[PDB]
């Protein structure tokens, strides 16, 4: 329960409404106990009085409590569900922002080891299970504590050796059972999230390699392997449901032990009088109705083990040290940046392959550059070095005759605008997908840039407010590439380095943007990286690299005239 410390400090921001949602969970749980205890005594008090003493018996005060203890049992429950769900939703906001803030400096490098689709579905699932802490673990356990105390202090007035037994039995089952079952299920919980991940990798391997597995005959013996991890996985689940069933047979036997004891012990005498009279049904109906407060406690040993596991998975993810750090020094962003490389080497962490070995190049101001190479040659990795996603081992990068490690983080984003290979379409509006680049751009200027990229079709039917993204209006692959270039125009950086534009297009539209790149970014040092050769005559100093090293470079004619690698794979 040490893992929860960074996240129990986010609750403290909303401590004064979390407690209100808890107090209502105590007033409601006290009306339920009070209504059944008062009614139980009232039947026994009146029946003992009988017909003979009906006039002396006052049936107007208890009948005023019942009218009151029933209007707080239903108004409290309605407000305990709102005020508690309201508090859970407000804590979620502080958890979404906290997770995003810590996962932001680690975005390219701290998450490269995992699977981005698989990881980011785990992180969203984890932040959801931290909300369960208040509703499933804290409110059921804190609320069940002060309910026991007040129904022990309250019944302490009538007698003490009795009210202590309810206090005793109900508090040990509150303090001893949640630990003794969390501890018992600790072994399977770690053995159940291991077999779930194991079954997920074996299923992904089976489904992906569905073409290779069938042909070589192995599609059957990797299904049996997959179906045998499931069998073990479904015994870890069973050993975990046989432990939720056991924690329900204990709270029902413990609840029996309290009722049987107050049926026996309260028979001897309640307080002074040896015969208790109606008070023997006040104790028994309190013992019977008090274990309503501890019904949520039965299942809170499981919902705690999930939050502990989730707080570990997300404190691990967000406590990684960033692979790059930016100086605090201020600087003035300057146009016409002349980028240079001097023998930068790079090896991805936990790996032996050198993904980028001994690459060096020179890009003067205004000098468009094209980098060409096969798939998996490390061209996009060279472009991660320039945006400071990683740091090159034993290398040196200079941006306008000064090291790029000396630029302020905010200033660096101003002097380098990139067009990512995987263009991302945020779910927000079109205006919010273009103000992404420049936040203060006017609505009119934002329209004409999107007009000049040749994406006029998006300006129809109130396009600037249309909801494109995951919700609807999904852009095609062809016109999603035109959107990224639109952002790189709003941002207006002196150096605009592109990563495989004109990829996945057709011949007629890829010549549109590739002309657009050299039409408006004439004053920019482009440094385009593509594996598709087209219209490279406008680019000077074409650079060809294979396997993380520049094979040969020069102007378009020079590699074509000279017998070289570029000339070789140009034709044929």
């Amino acid at each position: 329960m040490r893992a929860l410390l960074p996240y129990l400090a986010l609750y403290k921001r909303h401590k004064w409404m979390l407690s209100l949602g808890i107090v209502l969970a105590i007033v409601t749980l006290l009306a339920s106990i009070g209504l059944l205890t008062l009614s139980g005594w009232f039947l026994s008090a009146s029946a003992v009085a009988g017909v003979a003493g009906l006039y002396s018996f006052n049936y107007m005060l208890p009948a005023a409590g019942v009218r009151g203890a029933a209007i707080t049992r239903t108004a409290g429950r309605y407000f305990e569900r709102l005020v508690s769900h309201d508090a859970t939703f407000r804590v979620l906001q502080h958890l979404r922002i906290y997770t995003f803030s810590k996962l932001l400096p680690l975005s390219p490098a701290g998450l490269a080891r995992y699977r981005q689709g698989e990881l980011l579905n785990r992180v969203v699932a984890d932040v959801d299970t931290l909300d369960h802490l208040y509703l499933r673990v804290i409110s059921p356990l804190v609320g069940a504590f002060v309910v026991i105390m007040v129904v022990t202090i309250g019944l302490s007035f009538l007698d003490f050796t009795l009210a202590f037994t309810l206090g005793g039995i109900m508090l040990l089952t509150l303090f001893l059972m949640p630990p003794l079952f969390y501890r018992a299920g600790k072994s399977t919980g770690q053995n159940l999230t291991h077999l779930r991940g194991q079954y997920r990798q074996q299923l992904t391997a089976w489904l992906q390699g569905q073409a290779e597995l069938t042909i070589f005959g192995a599609s059957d013996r990797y299904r049996t392997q997959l179906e045998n991890t499931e069998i073990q996985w479904l015994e870890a689940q069973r050993r975990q449901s046989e432990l939720t069933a056991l924690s329900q047979a204990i709270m029902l036997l413990i609840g029996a032990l309290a009722v049987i004891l107050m049926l026996w012990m309260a028979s001897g005498g309640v307080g002074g009088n040896a015969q208790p009279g109606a008070l023997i049904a006040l104790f028994v109906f309190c013992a019977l109705a008090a274990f309503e407060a501890l019904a949520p406690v039965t299942g809170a040993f499981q919902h705690l083990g999930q939050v502990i596991a989730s707080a570990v998975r997300i404190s691990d993810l967000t406590d990684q040290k960033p692979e790059v750090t930016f100086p605090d020094t201020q600087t003035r962003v300057a146009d016409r940046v002349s980028l240079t490389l001097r023998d930068v080497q790079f090896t991805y962490p936990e790996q032996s392959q050198q993904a980028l070995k001994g690459i060096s190049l020179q890009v003067n101001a205004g000098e468009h550059i094209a980098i060409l190479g096969r798939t998996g040659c490390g061209k996009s990795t060279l472009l991660q070095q320039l945006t400071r996603a990683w740091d090159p081992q034993q290398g040196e990068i200079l941006l306008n005759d000064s090291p790029i490690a000396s630029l302020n983080e905010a200033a660096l984003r101003q002097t380098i605008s990139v067009v990512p290979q995987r263009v991302h379409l945020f779910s927000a509006t079109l205006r919010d997908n273009l103000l992404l680049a420049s936040p203060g751009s006017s609505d009119e200027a934002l329209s004409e840039i999107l007009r000049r990229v040749g994406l006029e079709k998006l300006l129809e039917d109130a396009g600037l407010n249309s909801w494109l993204g995951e919700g609807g209006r999904q852009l095609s692959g062809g016109e999603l590439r035109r959107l990224a270039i639109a952002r790189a125009l709003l941002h207006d950086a002196p150096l605009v380095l592109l990563d495989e534009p004109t990829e996945g297009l057709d011949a007629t539209t890829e010549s549109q943007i590739l002309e657009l790149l050299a039409e408006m970014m004439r004053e920019k040092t482009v440094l385009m990286v593509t594996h598709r050769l087209r219209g490279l005559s406008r680019f000077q100093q074409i650079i060809v690299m294979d396997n993380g090293q520049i094979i040969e470079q020069g102007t378009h004619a020079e590699l074509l005239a000279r017998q070289g690698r570029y000339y070789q794979f140009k034709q044929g």
């Binding site: 009085a49 203890a69 939703f89 922002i97 975005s107 390219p108 029996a256 050769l533 396997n547 794979f569």
Partner: protein, 580 residues
């Protein structure tokens, strides 16, 4: 059609009907024991309150009361283990049904979605339906047994008390169903706006690098703040009414304990006398109604707490029903088997090989490849070249007659045919534990000498020492470069002799060193058996016995390279490749 989902879910229930009948049965035995432990308490309490009998005298009813609490605990333990066993029997049976569907559809349909997205449909969309069968559905059958048993056990004692509980029986569903109105006024206008805000956090996580590039990281936090806050106050218009349905149930369980207390409490006082059967109102007849009034509404209150069990299993069943119902074109299979391990001859005419959805992929085509002859297949991007290789592998269903060594393919048994077929593929996958099990995928029991020759022939040993753990290195663990993941996928293709070899694209997406290294091992490996290799580079194709050209799924060319090149008809050799 949210009702049709629930209809489907209940349809799936029949798998473990023997287990959901014990849970239904034990919801009756656990309803009798609740009545027994209430009658015994009422009979014990009356004696010590009215007759002042000492506790040690009425020792027998205590023993039956203790024995009733032990039995009731045992049944609640029991019907939780039966309930789970019901749940993990539908899940174990749907998952097998889903996996069988995926295996039959073949690789052609699996590649329609990322393999991280077929795992949600199997790992999470299946596990989500557990709480609907383990907990919610047995509890739905406990919410009609115990309430009826409670009333039926009170009616002999006092029909007025049995009418206070049953009086709220029609008034509870009426008001909750009146709150159903308000779930069509708050979950209807907010259905859209509240669906653009569920994936608002994930979509900003998926694009952090895009946010980091433009430096908008600290200004998209305010967009999480302004979309999470709006999601809160959008979804309380729903919850300011959907919690009334909870308030109604908690109100009527308070009015039902109030009325039973007020009616009984006055009945002993003699103020009102209408309930009992003119036999006096014993105290036990009153305790038996206070002990059972919370129990009457207890299963229905717990059924409220199983909302999220129902909430998950309706979202999960949404995507599962569509998948299970889509029409698919699984390849037609037979039991014919050919025992000629020698190179086969493929013949085809009018092959309209068809994708799983039913759309035609490659149009009419006619060709013939004699045994021992290797035939490059070249064409423009998407011209039916890659599909023609799947069709010979069995992943696609064809229309016309195709013959393999004088026998048709559709009636050829895939398990026996694919023992004579070896292929590489484009974007090859290594679906095994290590780099040693991937090479030995054809025969896992291969000797070290045979494995060592395969690694050397495909030149896997060049990059082998510079790997961490050697030949047993796991492959997340050690991301082999594509130049090396294509050389282990080619040491596996030619590990064992075959009859037909199909190299989809061996030299593409490869570095300069492995290009001349793989092909050096795949020009020797293409002589031994018929090989239908597919490439886009014709620089060195003269040695190849035949060359085919496909455009828009139609084959248009034959003959060797020498006679075709000088032919100057539909020849793409003069066109410089654009994806190089």
């Amino acid at each position: 059609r949210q009702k049709e989902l629930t209809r489907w879910l209940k349809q799936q229930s029949v798998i473990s009907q023997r287990w959901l009948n014990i849970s239904r049965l034990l919801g009756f035995v656990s309803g009798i024991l609740i009545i027994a432990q209430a009658w015994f308490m009422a009979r014990i309490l009356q004696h010590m309150i009215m007759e002042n009998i000492p506790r040690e005298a009425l020792l027998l009813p205590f023993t039956l009361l203790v024995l009733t609490f032990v039995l009731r605990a045992w049944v609640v333990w029991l019907r939780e283990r039966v309930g789970y066993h019901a749940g993990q029997h539908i899940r174990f049976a749907i998952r097998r049904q889903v996996l069988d569907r995926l295996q039959q559809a073949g690789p052609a349909w699996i590649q329609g979605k990322p393999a991280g997205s077929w795992a949600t449909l199997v790992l999470e969309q299946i596990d989500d339906m557990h709480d609907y069968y383990a907990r919610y559905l047995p509890q739905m059958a406990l919410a009609v047994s115990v309430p009826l048993l409670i009333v039926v056990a009170i009616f002999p004692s006092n029909w007025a008390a049995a009418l206070i509980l049953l009086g709220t029986a029609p008034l509870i569903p009426l008001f909750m169903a009146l709150v159903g109105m308000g779930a069509a006024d708050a979950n209807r206008r907010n259905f859209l706006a509240l669906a653009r805000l569920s994936g608002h956090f994930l979509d900003r996580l998926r694009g952090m690098e895009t946010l980091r590039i433009f430096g908008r990281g600290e200004a998209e936090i305010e967009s999480i703040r302004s979309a999470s806050e709006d999601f809160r106050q959008r979804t309380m218009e729903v919850l300011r009414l959907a919690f009334l349905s909870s308030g109604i149930l908690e109100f009527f369980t308070s009015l039902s304990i109030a009325l039973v207390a007020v009616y009984f409490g006055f009945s002993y006082l003699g103020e009102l006398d209408f309930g009992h059967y003119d036999t006096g109102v014993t105290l036990a007849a009153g305790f038996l109604a206070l002990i059972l009034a919370p129990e009457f509404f207890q299963p229905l209150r717990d059924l409220g707490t199983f909302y999220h069990a129902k909430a998950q299993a309706v979202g999960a069943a949404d995507s599962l029903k569509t998948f299970m119902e889509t029409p698919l074109a699984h390849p037609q299979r037979g039991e014919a088997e050919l025992a000629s391990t020698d190179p086969v001859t493929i013949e085809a005419e009018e092959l309209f090989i068809t994708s799983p959805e039913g759309k035609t992929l490659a149009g009419p085509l006619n060709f013939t490849l004699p045994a021992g002859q290797r035939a490059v297949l070249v064409g423009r991007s998407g011209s039916g070249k890659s599909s023609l290789l799947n069709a010979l592998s069995g992943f696609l269903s064809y229309q016309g007659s195709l013959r393999i060594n004088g026998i048709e393919l559709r009636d050829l048994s895939p398990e026996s045919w694919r023992k004579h077929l070896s292929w590489v593929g484009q974007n090859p996958q290594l679906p095994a534990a290590t780099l040693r099990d991937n090479v030995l995928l054809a025969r896992p029991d291969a000797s070290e000498q045979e494995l060592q020759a395969a690694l050397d022939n495909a030149w896997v040993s060049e990059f082998l020492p510079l790997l961490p753990q050697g030949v047993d290195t796991p492959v997340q663990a050690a991301r082999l470069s594509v130049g090396q993941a294509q050389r282990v996928a080619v040491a596996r293709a030619l590990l064992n002799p075959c009859s037909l070899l199909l190299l989809d694209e061996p030299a593409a997406s490869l570095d300069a060193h492995s290009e001349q290294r793989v092909m050096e091992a795949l020009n020797a490996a293409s002589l031994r058996q018929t090989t239908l290799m597919v490439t886009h580079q014709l620089e060195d194709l003269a040695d190849w016995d035949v060359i085919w050209v496909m455009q828009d799924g139609r084959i248009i060319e034959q003959g060797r390279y020498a006679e075709l090149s000088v032919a100057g008809g539909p020849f793409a050799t003069l066109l410089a490749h654009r994806q190089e």
